């Protein structure tokens, strides 16, 4: 094994950025005390920074000069705090017994370690199920994640369902108040792959947001979901909960449809809803060529603003949650929006946008944000 323990040299910002990412979600005082720590391992290929909680894994590879092979387990949060605050110079790390000597410029640290024999072996990644550009994975997750439930006291809403059939990937999440679904195409190895899993929203959202550099993001299914690429790699334990069968909820037709400018509507909602009781609801009176947004009671004040809008169908008065509604409009990432309506008590179907008097079909899109209204 050898007398000289792990000894290496690397840039600090390269060191710091990799440790900050792996260390971010580590537990502060876990029942198993090693998980609090971060494990460094040098080899010919460079230095690897590892993190684990028995549920979620993080592993970052950085180029480094390895003077001697070895591994060491040191406190996670502190070491990301150290290298973030060190001067911009090379970092020398030398493991001395149960301690680690870290020197950068004129700064020197000796930090205690934990037994490297007590660190769990990280899960191995399943075989690669396919890969997609990091920019698309970032956008796809951002759209659907906003609709997942934010409260673990009802977990079944806290996940993002990932359905993979061949080259088509479908992502869905819902809190029972709103459903977001985006379809995309990716490069799958191999064709005829079909699997569906449900992943905790917040972590899968973090892996996507942290992945805009972007290189190419690889997803591995085998249960756990690996997300690899751009020198970083992570496995996430799936969720047991049953996701609703969600395509029965999407309407095929609408009694009325309306297309608007989203930036203009988002600003209107935010200002009108200032007097809305509890941010509960905003009213929208759809007539032809106009929508009148209104909220509030004699309680606080009342507000109303009229917007221009291409409308088809008979006039409809419907009220939505202003927060849920602006969440959807922000998810389209398009200049305009298309509202599928039926009744004031049924779901409204929002769609990104760049007939006669009869029932209007729902036009196919890659993204859909379906929102439930409020009483009146």
């Amino acid at each position: 094994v050898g007398l000289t323990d792990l000894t290496f040299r690397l840039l600090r910002e390269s060191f710091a950025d990799a440790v900050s990412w792996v260390a971010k979600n580590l537990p502060a005082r876990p029942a198993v005390p090693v998980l609090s720590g971060v494990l460094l391992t040098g080899s010919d290929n460079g230095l690897t920074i590892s993190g684990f909680d028995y549920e979620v894994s993080a592993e970052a590879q950085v180029g480094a000069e390895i003077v001697s092979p070895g591994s060491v387990l040191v406190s996670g949060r502190l070491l990301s705090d150290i290298t973030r605050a060190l001067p911009n110079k090379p970092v020398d790390v030398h493991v001395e017994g149960n301690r680690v000597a870290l020197t950068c410029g004129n700064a020197r640290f000796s930090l205690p370690t934990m037994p490297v024999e007590d660190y769990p072996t990280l899960p191995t990644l399943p075989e690669e199920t396919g890969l997609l550009p990091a920019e698309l994975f970032a956008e796809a997750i951002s759209q659907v994640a906003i609709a997942a439930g934010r409260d673990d006291t009802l977990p079944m809403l806290t996940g993002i369902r990932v359905e993979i059939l061949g080259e088509t990937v479908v992502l869905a999440a819902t809190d029972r108040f709103r459903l977001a679904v985006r379809e995309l195409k990716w490069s799958a190895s191999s064709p005829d792959i079909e699997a569906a899993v449900l992943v905790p929203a917040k972590t899968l959202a973090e892996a996507a947001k942290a992945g805009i550099g972007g290189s190419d993001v690889r997803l591995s299914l085998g249960g756990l979901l690996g997300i690899s690429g751009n020198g970083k790699r992570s496995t996430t334990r799936l969720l047991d909960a049953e996701f609703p069968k969600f395509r029965q909820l999407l309407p095929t037709e609408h009694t009325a449809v309306a297309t608007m400018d989203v930036a203009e509507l988002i600003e209107a909602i935010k200002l009108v809803a200032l007097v809305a009781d509890r941010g509960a609801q905003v009213r929208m009176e759809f007539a032809d060529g106009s929508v009148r947004l209104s909220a509030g009671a004699d309680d606080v004040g009342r507000a109303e603003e009229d917007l221009v809008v291409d409308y088809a169908g008979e006039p409809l008065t419907i009220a939505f949650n202003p927060t849920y509604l602006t969440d959807g409009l922000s998810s389209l990432r398009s200049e305009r929006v298309s509202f599928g309506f039926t009744t004031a008590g049924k779901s409204a179907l929002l769609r990104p946008v760049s007939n006669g008097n009869g029932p209007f079909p729902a036009v196919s899109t890659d993204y859909v944000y379906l929102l439930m209204p409020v009483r009146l």
């Binding site: 029972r176 108040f177 459903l179 909820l249 949650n321 779901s347 439930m372």
Partner: peptide, 5 residues
């Protein structure tokens, strides 16, 4: 508020 399901 209303529910999808």
């Amino acid at each position: 508020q209303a529910d999808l399901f």
